[model samples]
Target chain A: MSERIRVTEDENDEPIEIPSEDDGTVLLSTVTAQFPGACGLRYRNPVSQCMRGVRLVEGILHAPDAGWGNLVYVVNYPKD
Target chain B: MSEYIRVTEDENDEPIEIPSEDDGTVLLSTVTAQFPGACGLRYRNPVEQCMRGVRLVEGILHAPDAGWGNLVYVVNYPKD
Candidate 1:
């Protein structure tokens, strides 16, 4: 297994070096802090609905079909 | 609006504080890097389907019904 991975944010004109593993919080926290202000992230783990970390391949987040309702929901914008 | 949010991971015995906005890369990147190995995140944005970042509200990544077929995909594990 390779201990290195990189993600490209084509939309931002910059590729980012992100963490490979820690917990669902690290991903949420890193993304939220990128903004002008610190905000909240809402994502439900489809497999277990737990705040479990995720895996990255190439340069994107990977998730499977949560059957139907359950999904890794990301709000359009921060709330409060 | 309050510029703070918290996500609790009952499955891991720790409450995580995630980010609110940052293109889809940040969320995917952060989550993927949280594992013991640097992996990949395969998540498809439901609304825009772009690598655009997501919003967080009340300690969760929320995404409304993306109609049908099209949905946010987070692979259960890393790919390659």
Candidate 2:
């Protein structure tokens, strides 16, 4: 009942706020909760064409593949 | 019959000789042909504590999560 962050699908996708109870976990179940399969996350790399994994930092959950483009995809894990 | 390599699970996982015509693809269908789900690919970084993506080089396929302590976890696309 304290901290939270808003996550989204890919960069072009929409963003949604969710409880950041457990920030470090990307089991697909962790991702699709908001992004779903088609929108499922993807990190397109800022200087490359590779996909990176999800990362939870400060109070944010980045989805499967993410920005840079911007940097850091977002996600949420309800602390389980 | 020109170029090929044997892929394996994680670093400690076993190896399998597979034909490689396409060294750039990991659709899950690609890795498990030899290693199964529990053995899904993972790129345990060479220095930092993070996971990297699969990469194909010189006709070899690295699994999802992979090596760095040893380096290059292997998987075969089975030429689909």
Candidate 3:
């Protein structure tokens, strides 16, 4: 395994984790293209309203729906 | 490392893969609960409209937004 990041579930009552290996490069590009002003924005499960983000290293897909559904953006840790 | 299944991207231009270890249990449950009539249904990325699905093995989070945002369900292969 490259690394292994943990992606916490959003408030929308969904279970997800960040691949420890993802560096957030591709994810960031996808996010910026889809959801503007979403940079550094945490992932909030519209279902549960939970706020969290994941670290991408080695570019692994940890969750089932990761980067497949209606994703707003991948939030960076803390802020900036 | 366990077995790793390949998840092809949907026509929507999304990248995804099925976990090698997953036998389609938890994912099926989540899908059935969230999206009815989705069982055995293929995943078509709205962006590209490509039809596909991923297998959940060892319960890995391959993608960043997997099972977090507006996910309809985890589609099975072929048909019932």
User: Worst ten-residue run, lDDT, model 3 chain B?
Assistant: B27-36
Task: List each model's interface RMSD.
Answer: 9.9, 13.6, 14.1
lDDT of 2 by residue, A1-80 (tens): 22333456544867664333343323344335544432222233343333332332222333222222243344322212
* Each model's fraction of native contacts: 0.12, 0.00, 0.00
Docking class of 2: incorrect
RMSD for each model, in Å, please? 17.3, 14.4, 15.0
Best by TM-score: 2
lDDT of 3 by residue, B10-77 (tens): 33533232223242233332222222233343444566667545334443333323432334333443
Residue-level lDDT tens digits of model 3 in A3-71 = 333332244654433332343224434433433323323344454443222223222223333532333
Off by over 4 Å in 1: A1-49, A52-80, B1-20, B27-29, B43-70, B76-80
Compared with the real two-chain complex, what DockQ does model 2 have?
Answer: 0.06
Using TM-score, rank the candidates from best to worst: 2, 3, 1
Native RMSD of candidate 1 (Å) = 17.3
lDDT per residue (tens digit) for residues A1-80 in model 1: 11212333233565333342322223334444443322222244443444433333333333322211122233213222
True-vs-predicted CA distance for residue A80, candidate 2, Å: 24
Docking class of 1: incorrect
